[PDB]
Design a binder for this molecule. Sequence first.
Ligand SMILES: COc1cc2cc(C(=O)CCC(=O)O)sc2cc1OCCCOc1c(OC)cc2sc(C(=O)CCC(=O)O)cc2c1F
Lengths: 176, 172
Amino acid sequence: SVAHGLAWSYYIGYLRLILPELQARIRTYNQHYNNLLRGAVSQRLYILLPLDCGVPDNLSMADPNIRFLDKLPQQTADRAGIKDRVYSNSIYELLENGQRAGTCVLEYATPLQTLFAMSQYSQAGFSREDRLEQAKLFCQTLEDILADAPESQNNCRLIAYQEFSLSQEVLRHLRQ
Amino acid sequence: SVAHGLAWSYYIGYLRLILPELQARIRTYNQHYGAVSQRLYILLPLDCGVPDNLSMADPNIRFLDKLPQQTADRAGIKDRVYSNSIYELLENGQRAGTCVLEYATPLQTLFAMSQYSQAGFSREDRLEQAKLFCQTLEDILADAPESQNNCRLIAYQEFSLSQEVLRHLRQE
Ligand SMILES: COc1cc2cc(C(=O)CCC(=O)O)sc2cc1OCCCOc1c(OC)cc2sc(C(=O)CCC(=O)O)cc2c1F
């Protein structure tokens, strides 16, 4: 299946490589780069899983209550012949009634945009109406893989949703 | 199919985003500094063996430099960095070529899936999946001119990896 392969690849090709190094990057930010007066950035990568497969590039566009704070210090690694392949991640403030309710590392699972694009291109042999079932299968496969990887599971949170306040969706997970 | 999805995702999620900007990065590198050839040379090992160091696979493939990085806001990641590496290709102690080179990382997903019981993917099906990944990628690129002329697909089964790359480089 398409979504089955995409979830395994998202784990093998990305999550497996960044999640064991994420805690140290967040700790480094909180100790040396975070504004001295501010609350600590929460641990864990918060992964946005829009079931409609809509993956925008700017988060403040999806919700003005999601405001860009800072980039986490970059991770580098030699990867498949790419010397010092760079992994960059962004920190966001979550506003509730004009005030800071949370601070976290946040991004969309980019393979969901592949499902969106495939549903549009005739050559992909992927019907438009197959998108939702494939997005749910991508999320379920990712949950199943993470359940067998505790250093990856405890370093991330899966935020699956169907449309709305995206910041309230993230805050509900953060407050747990 | 697993490989069909991987090839579409490798194109949508990566190649489509770096290949229209690649020529300008190579030109910028060549003008500061014998020229690095155009096009991203994509290694497609059908055995799905994806090592992290290229000089390990072949000592005639020597790291020269990193191309200037590309940055873009991508899915909530501000200034998502795309870094690529330049390699010298040696032949009988002489530099015979210079190119931007890397492995197609989804091939390592096929390798890992054939290793993990929970993936439900057999080692006996891996070669057919690696070939399908390569064929799907070729078909996609045939419909994306700006991506097709900015890359070269190097599919092989094991050996001299530098001679494999040089054979493709000498066709232009
Ligand atoms: C190797 O496989 C994958 C690598 C991978 C890397 C990712 C990221 O860096 C997240 C941010 C982003 O997508 O820009 S998501 C991701 C998903 C992957 O598997 C899904 C199937 C292949 O599709 C993709 C992809 O889909 C969205 C994104 C990328 S980004 C990428 C590279 O940057 C190449 C070098 C590297 O793999 O680290 C390859 C792929 C890719 F093959």
